[PDB]
Structure 1
């Protein structure tokens, strides 16, 4: 469910594995590759997801 729940996409500090695994399966991607995907979206930064 697309809730406005904050989740830090750095690959070690999530601990909310439900949305993390759902995003990784839906985007067919790794944790690191998801983090650099989010970093490309904000110009090399990760403000807040």
Structure 2
């Protein structure tokens, strides 16, 4: 469910494995790889996901 739930996309500090595993399966991406995918969309930063 696309809920407005805050989630830290840095590869060690989420511990919300359901949403993050769904993003990894949907985007065909790792932890690190999803994190740099979010850094590209914000100019090398991660404000709040």
* Alignment TM class, shorter chain as reference: over 0.9
Root mean square deviation of aligned Cα: 0.3
CA distance in 1, matches of 2:23, 2:45: 19
CA distance in 2, matches of 1:28, 1:37: 11
Structure 2 alignment gaps of length 5 or more = none
Structure 1 alignment gaps of length 5 or more = none
**TM-score between both structures, scaled by the size of structure 2:** 0.99
After superposing on structure 2, the runs of 4+ consecutive aligned residues of structure 1 that deviate more than 6 Å are none
**TM-score between both structures, scaled by the size of structure 1:** 0.99
SS of equivalent to 2:38? helix
CA distance in 1, matches of 2:37, 2:27: 10
